[PDB]
Amino acid sequence: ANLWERFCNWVTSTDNRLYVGWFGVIMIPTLLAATICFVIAFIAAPPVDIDGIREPVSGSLLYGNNIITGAVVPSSNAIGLHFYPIWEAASLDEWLYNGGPYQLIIFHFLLGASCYMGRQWELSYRLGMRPWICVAYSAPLASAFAVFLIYPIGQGSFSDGMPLGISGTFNFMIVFQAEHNILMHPFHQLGVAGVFGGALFCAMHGSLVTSSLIRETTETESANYGYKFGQEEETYNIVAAHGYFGRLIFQYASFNNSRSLHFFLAAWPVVGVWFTALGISTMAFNLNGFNFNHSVIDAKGNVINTWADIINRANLGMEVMHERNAHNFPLDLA
């Protein structure tokens, strides 16, 4: 075989301990770059002027943070949506001051994660499986796109992307609630349904299978040794599991079909997370959660407060305090 033929055979080989594939040829370098830059920046990067007002925020461990407070800080509001690679800076010192590592990391990560999804498809094809695991992965990936790219595009600045850190994530969430009332947005409510229900159904399915395990071991041995990798027969009694759950609620509220059951397990959380990703990606264009502020009024015209008005008071506190030195005019329009 010619050199290119041999290289293609190696790239697409199903015998490699980790599959490479053509998506992997892009994924590996980009994810390595993103990872190396993230680790170095998280440990050692100097403070970054996130809001473009010459007030650098310290994100790295060596500059006074711990694991909970540390972060790779988003790029400066002075940069907006401008592309800021290393070679666009006069020096690495300037690049760091303006928060270039954030752009490098998130761009390489988004590209690499897209390729990760494609790689899931590709390996399924090589192994003769059905192809839709990548479709399941599209939900979290869409969420990453929403918080790292779409929201910055809509708001006009990568400085409004989610910071790469724990407390930074909390800051992003609180400001988002102040400016969009995400809690009152149906898509985030669907996301909560998705994740609460995903956890619920995870526990339910695990508990039902575990409760219907067939006896193959003694009390001194872990029941897990009752299953041998690759055995032909099923290891639990789905008929008994259905008898139990159908009597727990009622017969027709319980799956007797394992394929239907596992499809439901896949579908519930995946759809919920799709919708929550769309919630972030649409509030990116300032279509916000429901606003019932002062919706209830009495005969004279007095405002009768509701829990929504209480929420509004909390949101006002957040709004007036966030980015305390950045606003010069009365309205926060982005």
């Binding site: 490699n16 499986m129 994740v195 027969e233 099923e234 007797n256 007036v320 305390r324």
Partner: protein, 176 residues
């Protein structure tokens, strides 16, 4: 009302900073992840047990054979993610274990908050920030947000206190 409960916990308890809520979050999101990934893996490693393009009719509850290939699923995840399940019993017990443990951890955190026993501050950061007005982190930013929440929501959310906060005492940034 539940949403107000969330925001009250953020503003007064700094609940997001609490490692027990963090473990609860891990449990809930990881449970959703397991639910989705297991459902999808089963549905995409099914055996062909019928001629229909809709594959649901090819399962019979009384059948003895597994309906999907554990071997193929294990190979796929080993090559994609590095590790994979090889024992179905362990897999399903883990699905029980994750969300249950997460919720229990969150409950412990709330027992703490019942006494105002919060993870509110990092003392080292507070000392540094008090002495050095150029030191700023996302932690201190979030504390400012909390102060805003408390001041602006207390008078109406706690009517029995009869709070009257004159406008001049309310914390506010520039122009807003």
């Amino acid at each position: 009302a539940i949403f107000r409960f969330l925001l009250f916990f953020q503003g007064f308890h700094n609940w997001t900073l609490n490692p027990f809520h963090m473990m609860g979050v891990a449990g809930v999101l990881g449970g959703a992840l397991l639910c989705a990934i297991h459902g999808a893996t089963v549905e995409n490693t099914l055996f062909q047990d019928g001629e229909g393009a809709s594959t649901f009719r090819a399962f019979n509850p009384t059948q003895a054979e597994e309906t999907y290939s554990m071997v193929t699923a294990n190979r796929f995840w080993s090559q994609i993610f590095g590790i994979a399940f090889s024992n179905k019993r362990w897999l399903h017990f883990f699905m029980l274990f994750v969300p249950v443990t997460g919720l229990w951890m969150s409950a412990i955190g709330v027992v703490g908050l019942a006494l105002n026993l919060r993870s509110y501050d990092f003392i080292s950061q507070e000392i540094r920030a008090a002495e050095d007005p150029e030191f700023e982190t996302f932690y201190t930013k979030n504390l400012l947000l909390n102060e805003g929440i408390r001041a602006w929501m207390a008078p109406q959310d706690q009517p029995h206190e009869n709070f009257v906060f004159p406008e001049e005492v309310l914390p506010r940034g520039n122009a807003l």
